[PDB]
Every structure is written in structure tokens, then in C-alpha cells.
Amino acid sequence: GITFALASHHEICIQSISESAINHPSQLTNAFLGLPLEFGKCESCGATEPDKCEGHFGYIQLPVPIYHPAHVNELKQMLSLLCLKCLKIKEASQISIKDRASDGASYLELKLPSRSRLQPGCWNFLERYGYRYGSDYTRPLLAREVKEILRRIPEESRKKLTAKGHIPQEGYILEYLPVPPNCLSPSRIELKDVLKKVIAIKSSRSGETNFESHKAEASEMFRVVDTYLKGSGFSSRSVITGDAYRHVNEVGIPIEIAQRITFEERVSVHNRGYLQKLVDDKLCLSYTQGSTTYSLRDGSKGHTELKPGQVVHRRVMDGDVVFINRPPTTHKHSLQALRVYVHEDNTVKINPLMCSPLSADFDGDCVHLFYPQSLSAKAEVMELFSV
Amino acid sequence: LIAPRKCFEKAAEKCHTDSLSTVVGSCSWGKRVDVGTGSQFELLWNQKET
Amino acid sequence: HSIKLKHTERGIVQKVVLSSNDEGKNFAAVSLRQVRSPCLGDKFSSMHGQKGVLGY
Amino acid sequence: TNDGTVRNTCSNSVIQFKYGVDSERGHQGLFEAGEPVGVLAATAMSNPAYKAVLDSSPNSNSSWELMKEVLLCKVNFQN
Amino acid sequence: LPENAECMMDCEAFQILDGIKGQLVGLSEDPSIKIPVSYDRALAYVESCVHYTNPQSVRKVLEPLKTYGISDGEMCVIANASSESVDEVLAFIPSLKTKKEVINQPLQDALEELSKL
Amino acid sequence: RKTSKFMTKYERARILGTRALQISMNAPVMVELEGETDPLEIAMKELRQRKIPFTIRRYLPDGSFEEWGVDELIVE
Amino acid sequence: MFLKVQLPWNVMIPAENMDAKGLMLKRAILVELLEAFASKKATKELGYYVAVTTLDKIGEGKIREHTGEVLFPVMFSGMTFKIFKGEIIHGVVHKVLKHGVFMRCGPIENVYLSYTKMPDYKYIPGENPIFMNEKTSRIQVETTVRVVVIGIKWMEVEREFQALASLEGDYLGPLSEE
Amino acid sequence: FRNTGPVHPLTRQPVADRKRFGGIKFGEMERDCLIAHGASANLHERLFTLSDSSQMHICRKCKTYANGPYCRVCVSSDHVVRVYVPYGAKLLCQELFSMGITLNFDTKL
DNA sequence: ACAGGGAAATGGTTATGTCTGCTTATCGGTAGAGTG
RNA sequence: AUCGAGAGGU
DNA sequence: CACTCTACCGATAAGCAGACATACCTCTCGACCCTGT
Ligand SMILES: [Mg+2]
């Protein structure tokens, strides 16, 4: 069972195999992120085909603290649920918490009740843990204070948090921004804009975080919280007609469809001569040996020797089983296994006796006739889906 | 069924998931489906008669 | 880089017409003709609603 | 499951003790142990509704509506 | 290491590998199986480092040392050391400067056993 | 454990599939009925008898397992 | 030095050797264990595998899909080889160089012996690289030397253990037969 | 028709332009009918073999997705597991790691 | 005529029901404790 | 190659 | 032993925005703007 968790900055730093930070626009198309583009080279892995490219992540040095937008409720409840704890190592009963919606940003508010009187020396733990910025009712709570109060966790708090159903991680403050690989290539434009904003703000930093810096520590948060946050192989579809002069388990197939699609089967000892007399007359298309595939087109002057390790796919002939899929119908009876029949026309022959299990009239309906590939799938379709 | 972002973030903040064998994982992660031919029964080979 | 015919495209070239506009953009079109006779699977219809597929 | 009782994949919960009537009559039905029925009952309940509502039948409209009503009842409801 | 993990002594690999090389004739005579490359190397190593001939007598005479509070690691050390002098055991483990004055007697016992056998 | 002692169709399909896949991997047949064109017929004639080399191991929802040989089980 | 370890392994066995008599199946599975074990070199946590002596328990085999082969999970006990820090080991030297010698300690073939810690032996150039000291002692091929390991280093590309020896000391001499 | 050929550059699936080759998409009705019939082998076959197939790796000790394979904390890639995972789940975990949610793939083998 | 940043607005306001869910006023309903 | 829209057989 | 007076939990509506167009599959026909050197 897969388990979800939060991405802490240390985990992003460990996952990031590159040591250099991404600061320039041209660094997004470098070589250590795989080969999803049409032109370029790789330095990390070097898998030349796109089917082997998995992608490599990255990180951006971001020294500014940003709150997690969609996890403000989790922090709210985790801060409201804890009992009153004085000393975190190893008058505060009426404390309340609220939020302010300032330009879309969800900032936490530590507001005191109006019935209580304000005292400059109260909450000495907040004073020793951080400097009091706002001496009024509006106090901007910086994420550093939250990280500092949440860094040292006692045993009882750990037990109660593991019992309630949550767990705090070092990922609420985004310090290392994970950058997705180039497998995807407006998101790129927003990434470029936010990169320009963060580099401008970093160039506009001088000293510790004060009011003169907090006045410029706003647009970043607003830009963060404003806009920053299957097919199948085998297939066949054609018009179906009526044919009541054949068995119920027999269904027709055109020439080109039977010529294109094949049926995979492993080489056995009981059919040593049959496979040879089928492969010498050039009816098969290709054959796979180990991890490489060899075609059966014109150009081979050497005889195709039989080997149990070399798998072959035989063209569908009388003796193959297939199941069909109809327009959506509640009944599972619509899916059925029928033997294939060879003919010269291009349409499919369906007897009128199969109209009650299905729902397709001969008025122009379309079906989806599939092909089993594995021999286990062959047994499954011949035993379960059979009439 | 509904907007995937809210349920995904809820599962992320929950961080508690048990080992279950429903349709989830069998059709999205490649796990063997636990109904039909892939139900709870094994095929250990016996050496006594062979 | 040239346009290659896809699956259901085949025929005998019946007309090749080439032309340009005032903006200096050369155009060109090739028309391919196929003649067909009713074959199994082709839908027919009358003046009164009934509609069916040739089956034999 | 193999025990003959209807089991659930989550928390190993039991829904029914045996799938199949145990009256005086006896028939060897196609229902076996390792066979899913919840999906089968889902399709077999969605089929009749479809017909009743695809046709414009007003007699079947009342019948379909009652079935629709029983399929929308909720734990919390008001007036 | 598992619960049934014990360090092997000397000349047991000699005997076992001599048995394997005796079987090697029929093993190579059968074209179904190929000969490994590690057996002959290990047997050359054990013939270059063979010192004892009987495991049972040396085991029964060293068992009192196992009772004296000696584990099997240093047992293998003194077995593959052919230990007998005080300088040899000093150069083997330099951390015995404080306990040589009591460990000299097991060294004399080992010398006597090696001289007897 | 099981009083009915009836083989389900799903286990039958599984064992026929694995028997065909085994006989299709350069392995001789237990019965002397070689010469077929498809491995499905070989697997069917093999399961039609009682001599089957492998058996099935059922699982219990309580968290245990019970063995049941194919020799004592009967097939329809 | 040689440690007895019990470890589970999923051995692959085809079905062309399936017969009624069981001793043939036992010989087949044994020779398949041997041919599968004589293909790798060693491991990082366990060490050099030497051989297998006795089988403990036989386990029932499971079938694999898409390939038609049965896998036998068998519990067996085997012999391994591992060298530890500070464990003095006897080795024979084969190749001599300018900066050190290439001594052979059983299967390991990359035990490095640094020359900077060689106070008494001096290098003599010529066809045969040799080291001679005041005690009239030589270290060459077929000659065993007693060294003390000070460290071990692993290599993932060669699958070998790089051990560095030490020769500094007082009155160091070769072993004398009695 | 379709035996093999090009796929989608994003989802690694057969394209919708069925003029040449291509290939239809597996619908929910097909999966519903398959689970109703009680089939698991051919379902996984059509879901992995004929569809987008790939590979995945993680440390036995660590609980993160390892990109051959290398995890940085436990440098010893000697303890890795290779399990068959389709490309859809790979894109999903990639997108979740891009958003900021890590995945703990609990694997027995 | 092309590289680089991320903008460019025009006021306007009479024209799917029907619902689930989330967040605010409104109504009582207490429940004490100043008095008595 | 990509996106969106429109027109279709079920 | 009766009175009044405001702190606290409910029930309330009561207002507030959203949210939604079964599914398999076919074909053709156009797709960001203002400004500086
Ligand atoms: Mg119709």
C-alpha cells in the first residue's frame, strides 16, 4: 500500500542529484535532466531513446519563507488541538487564532481577545524565541517562529499527534523549490515570472528581516498563492453484417485486419514442424529473440532456425479466439469469445442469434474487436468469455 | 469522482494509508487484480507425486 | 519535408492547381479520384426513413 | 471468499453469510466462491432503469421514478 | 550474521576442497555442468596456509579456552596465527599492553600445544 | 475446511493457462498423447485426467491457509 | 574468516527435467544451484561466497507468469568469506611494482601494500622487482608475507575489496618452518 | 487496425488520429465488463504489455523514488527493487513531486 | 524591423433553476452572581 | 507536432 | 426568596459564493499585443 507524505526541504535536497542552483533561463534546458527534447545531449544517464528517459528533478535556492497555501487548515487544527504546554523542552488559556485574506494571501493571525488587557512583557516565550515586530493588535506572524516552535517536539505531543492522525514535517516552509524535468516540454511563463521576482527580491535584500524588508516581502507571497497553484495496443473497428449459415462461435474477419495483427505464441515441441512449415512460406511478420526483434521481410538469405527462446507471432487463422466490445451496455453478456473466420470482404459477419446478448442492430453500429496476446490471456478468453 | 486536488491534498496531509487491494493500484499501479482469476489462492508446486 | 498520403488515401490525380495571393504565399492543391461501387457495409436510405446496411 | 460468505476487500468486513437461496428448492447455480457480484448487481440494476427511461412510457415513468428515489436517499435529509 | 553463524577453523576447507577436487573428475567428465573458477584458487590458498591436521583434538583442547571467556573470533585469530610468542600476539592486537601480564599464560599454553602437535 | 470440494471455474482457467504455458516451454507431457497442433488441446486432455503435477493453495480471510490436493478434488 | 550464513534464494528451474523419480529432480536442482552460484563474485554486506555444504529445508515452488517456469524458494546454508578491519591475513604475492606489491589473499586480488610505510626494505630494479632488507629476506612470487590491514575500501565497478596493509614495526621477519 | 506503431508524445498511448495505425483508447465500460466477467490476467496484459510500459526503482532502506539507479543518502545501490509500473503512475508521481508531495512506495520484495 | 517584459482593458447593471456546502447574523436559553 | 471550436454514426 | 444584568453554549435561518453537464468513436476549420533601439 502506497503512503502519502509531505516533501521536506531535506528530502528535495537529497533527491536533487545536481549541486548547482537553477538561476538562469538557459539552465532549464541543460543536460542532466534526461533527453525529452529533439536536440541535445545528456550528462547524468544518457539513455538515447525516449522510452528509457525517466527524467531528473532539480532545486532552487530560495531563502525566503513561504507558507503552504492548501495546508493552512492542517496547521490551524494542529495548533488548536494541542493542550496547554508551558515549556517546550523535553493566562494563556484564552488564546485564539485567525486568518487574514490580504490580496489572496492566507496569513495566520494571533489576535488577543478584547476583554483581556495587553501587557508588554506577556508571552515571554514568544519574546525570547523571536523579536516582537508589531506592538499593535495586528501582528504579522513570520514562519520562522512557527518552525522554531515546531522544531523541538516533546514525547507527549508526538504521541498525541500520532494518535490524532497527522504528523508535522519540515516541508511547510518552501526553501528548495522543486523544478519538474523537461518531459512536459502558461506554467513555464509563471515559472519565469516567479524566478524574476525572487531574483529581484534577493538582489533587493540588505540585512535581516525587518519592516523595511517585510514591505518588499509581500508580492512574492501573492504571486505564489494567486496563480502558481489510456490507450490499448490491439484494436479493430468495422461495420458488422449478418451471417446465419455458420456456427455461433464463428465470426468473420477481413483480409487487411488479419494481415496486420498477429497472435503471439511460444515455441513448443509438439508443434515443431507446424511452425517451420508456417515460417518458411513467409506468412509471419517478425520474430523476437531475447531483447531484440528481427523482421521477416525480403532480404534474408538464411533459413530461420527454430529456437524455444525466439518467440514468434503467427497471423490469425482458423483456430484463434477473440473477444468483442460493444457500445456501452450494462450487460456483461455483450463481451463474448468467438472463433475467427477468414474471408475476402472488408466487413465483419455476426449471426442474428447474437443480437439478444449484444445491442447492435445491422443499421451501422460499430464494435471493438480485441486480440489476446499472452497465452494465459488466451486461456482466460477461451474458458470464461466462451459461449 | 470529484475534484482530484482536494482529495489528493487530504491524503497527503493524512500521511496514513493501509495496505489495501481494491481497484486502486490494480488498474493504476500495475498490481494484480484481487477478483476473478487473481483471487486469494496460490499455486505452489508439489514435489511428492512428481 | 513533404506531405505523404495516409491510410485511406489513394487515387488517380485528376487536377493539379497552383496559385498565390498578394502577400506572396504560393499555394498548391492535388486532387485524387476513386470510383466506388456499393460494397458490403454501405448504408442506404429511402425517402421515408428506413435505413440499412448492405449485407449480401 | 472461499468460505462461502460475502466478504469485503477493506478491513475484511462481511456483508452476507451466503450468496444463494437456501429454501426448499435446490439448484446448482453458476455463482461460485471467487466470483464478483457487486459489479454484477450494479450492472443488473442499471440495465432495467435504462430501458424504462429510454422509452417515453408514462406508466414506466412512475415506476422508474420510484427506483430513482430509492437510489438517492441520504443519511442526512431535511423536510 | 544468522543464528547458526560460526567462524570456521583451518584445514576444514582443505579437507572439503580436497573432496570437491576429487569429485571434479566426474564433474568435468559430465558435459552438463561447467567447472567453477574459485575452488582451485581457494584450495591453493589453503595449501599455502595449512598448519593443522586434526580438528577434533585441537577443538577439545581449546574448548577450556572457550570456557575461560574467549569468543570464536580471537579463536580463529590464534588458529591462523600459529600463535606462540609474546611478540607475535603483541603485533597481532596492539590493544593488549594492559592485559599481557595475564594473557601470557594462554600464549604459553598455545606454544605447548603447537609443540606437542 | 471446505465441505463442498468443488473447483471454481476461475481456478480451472488459471491452472489450464499455467499448464499450457508450462508445456509450451520445451517440456514433455505427463500423458502419452503427444502430436497435437495446439497446446490448448494438450492442456485440456491433461486436466481431463487426475494426474496433475501442481495443486492449489487456498487462502482464508482470517489470515491462514489450507492445502487441498487436486487428487482428492473432483472436476465437472 | 569463513562464516556459515543461511540465506533465502529464488532459484530458477525449467520443466524439461520433470520426471517421477525424485533423486533425479534432486540432482537437477543441486546442479542448477551450483551453476547459478558459479556466476557472481561477491557482495558488499556478506562477502565472498565460497560454496554450499548442506541443504536445510526444501520449499514448495511457485509458478511464474508469461514464461512458464516454476521458481523454487529454498532455504539453504552456505559458506562465505569476509575480511574485517585489523584482521591479520596471510597472503601470497604475485606482481611487484614500484609503489607496492599485488598480494593474493585467496580470492581477493587487489590488496594494495603502500611503499611509504616500508622503512627497511629497498627496491632493486631489474627483470624481477624485489625488496631486500638487512635481515636477508625477499618478497617475491610464491612467498608469503604477514601484514596488518589498516583499512578496507570497496569498488562497485570491479566488485572487489581494496585493503591497505602496513609494514611498519620493529624486528619484522618472515615465517620459519618448524 | 493496429498492431504496433507510433504513440502519444505525452501519455505514451496510441494516438486518436486513426488515419494511419493509431489505436483506440481503453474505455471504462471495457474495464467494467472485464471485472464483471472476473478477469485479471488479460486486463493487466492489455494495461502494461500492449500499453505504455516502463520500469521503477527504490532503496530497500530508503522510502523515496530512486532515479542507473542511485539514491543519495544510502549510496549503496546494491539494495534496489525493479517492479513493473506503467507510465501513467510514473507521470502521476512526477507531477506530485513537482507539486511538493512525496510518495512512500511500500514494497515487500 | 526584432529582442525583451509580462500587460491590454471597455464600463456595466438587466438577464437555470436547483442544489450542496461554507461562513455570518439572529434567536433564544441558560447560567451565573450582584442584590435582597 | 499542439490547442480550441464546429459538424457526425452509436 | 425574589428580582435585575450581561458572559457564554446551542439553533437557527440566511446569506454567500460555486457546480454540473454520461460514454466509444469519425470528420474539417483557425488559433495572445504594446513598445523601445
Ligand atoms: Mg443501431
Author numbering:
A (entry chain A): 16 to 105, 125 to 219, 234 to 277, 318 to 475
B (entry chain A): 1187 to 1236
C (entry chain B): 871 to 926
D (entry chain A): 792 to 870
E (entry chain D): 85 to 201
F (entry chain F): 59 to 134
G (entry chain G): 1 to 178
H (entry chain B): 1050 to 1116, 1130 to 1171
The authors write:
De novo DNA methylation in plants relies on transcription of RNA polymerase V (Pol V) along with KTF1, which produce long non-coding RNAs for recruitment and assembly of the DNA methylation machinery. Pol V transcription elongation complex functions as the assembly scaffold for targeted DNA methylation, and therefore plays a central role in RdDM pathway. KTF1 is a paralog of SPT5, the only universally conserved transcription elongation factor in all three domains of lives (NusG in bacteria and SPT5 in archaea and eukaryotes). Pol V is evolutionally derived from Pol II through gene duplication.
Here, we present the cryo-EM structure of Arabidopsis KTF1-bound transcription elongation complex of Pol V (KTF1-bound Pol V TEC). To assemble KTF1-SPT4-bound Pol V TEC, we reconstituted the complex using Arabidopsis thaliana Pol V core enzyme, the KTF1-SPT4 heterodimer, and a nucleic-acid scaffold comprising a pre-melted transcription bubble and a 30-nt RNA with 9-nt region complementary to the template DNA. The cryo-EM maps show strong signals for all 12 subunits of Pol V, 19-bp downstream DNA in the downstream dsDNA binding channel, 9-bp RNA-DNA hybrid in the active-site cleft, and 6-bp upstream dsDNA in the upstream dsDNA channel. Although the KTF1-SPT4 heterodimer was included in the complex reconstitution, the cryo-EM map only shows signal for the KOW5 domain of KTF1 bound near the RNA exit channel. The RNA-DNA hybrid of the transcription bubble in the active site cleft adopts the post-translocation state with the ‘i + 1’ site empty for binding of the incoming NTP. The bridge helix of Pol V-TEC adopts a straight conformation like that of Pol II, in sharp contrast to the bent conformation of Pol IV bridge helix that contains a two-residue deletion at the middle region. The clamp domain of Pol V exhibits disordered lid and rudder loops, and therefore loses interaction with the RNA-DNA hybrid. We infer that DNA binding is not able to induce clamp closure of Pol V due to the loss of above interactions, resulting in a wide-open DNA main cleft in the Pol V TEC structure. No cryo-EM map signal is observed for NGN domain of KTF1 and SPT4 near the upstream dsDNA channel, where SPT5-NGN and SPT4 locate in the Pol II TEC.The structure shows that KOW5 binds near the RNA exit channel, where it makes interactions with the C-terminal β strand of NRP(A/B/C/D/E)12 subunit, the wall (or flap) domain of the NRP(D/E)2 subunit, and zinc loop of NRP(B/D/E)3 subunit. KTF1-KOW5 domain interacts with Pol V mainly through polar interactions made by R615, R617, K622, Y624, R627, K639, S642, Q643, and H644.
